[PDB]
Amino acid sequence: VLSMEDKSNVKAIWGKASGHLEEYGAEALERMFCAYPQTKIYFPHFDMSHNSAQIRAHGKKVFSALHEAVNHIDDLPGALCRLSELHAHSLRVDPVNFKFLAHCVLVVFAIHHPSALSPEIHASLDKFLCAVSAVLTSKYR
């Protein structure tokens, strides 16, 4: 349901973020906490200051996970298996929260790579982030 062109599109915009997984990930999280503060209930133990050690470390783990997803874009379910267990079964993250984070990831690419996030590219990246979210909410039980 990601086409071949969608896949080539995602791989190319993702290449821009290489070298920047911590920085882009930290920013995607700060934007999620600030624009959608109801998401902060999931992170009680976190220093929420700008560039806190914790938010940077978490930004990096999130984006590294998304980077692996791009490298296994033909088998998202198997590349994201453990994380689906974690989010859906152990944390019971309400599914609406994956749309916020996905949106904040788009905003980070628009700020840093505005010419590279063209309308067709935006459409691909958005399809990839929906596909990632659907795997992470697939194990509620």
């Binding site: 934007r31 624009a35 700008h50 949106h103 628009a110 700020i111 309308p119």
Partner: protein, 146 residues
């Protein structure tokens, strides 16, 4: 909720910098590209088979200018967003039959277009201010749905 002085400042100071014709054309084109079912609501604008057709539709480009001019009237009625939008809410419901879940999809595209045109002004705090605005405007357009 009310806008505080810091939120109002972010909204008013950014909007003064926005090219509403260009941004508006861009946001409307991106929603028809990213969420293709929305093309059904505009099937009177013509050619909307693919992204190339959408970016070269003069009717899409002009309608996008008028949608963003209208959204930008929120910025002069921050106090009264719901009341100001009530007739448009009615026209969307009765005349255009648009499903109200779609209003929040366009709000998010507008945030992406603003981010890409004004990346230095669209700080974390500014984006939080705009996100509240776009959520109030989508709710005001959904309000006369009965």
């Amino acid at each position: 909720a009310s806008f505080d002085a810091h939120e109002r400042k972010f909204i008013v100071d950014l909007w003064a910098k926005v090219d509403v014709a260009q941004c508006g054309a861009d946001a409307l084109s991106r929603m028809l590209i990213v969420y293709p079912w929305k093309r059904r609501y505009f099937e009177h604008f013509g050619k909307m088979c693919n992204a190339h057709d959408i970016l070269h539709n003069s009717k899409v480009q002009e309608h996008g200018k008028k949608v963003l001019a209208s959204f930008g009237e929120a910025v002069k009625h921050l106090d009264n967003i719901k009341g100001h939008f009530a007739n448009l809410s009615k026209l969307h419901c009765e005349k255009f039959h648009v499903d109200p879940e779609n209003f929040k999809l366009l709000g998010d595209i507008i945030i992406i277009v603003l981010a890409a045109h004004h990346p230095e002004d669209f700080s974390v705090e500014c984006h939080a201010a705009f996100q509240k605005l776009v959520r109030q405007v989508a709710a005001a357009l959904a309000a006369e749905y009965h």
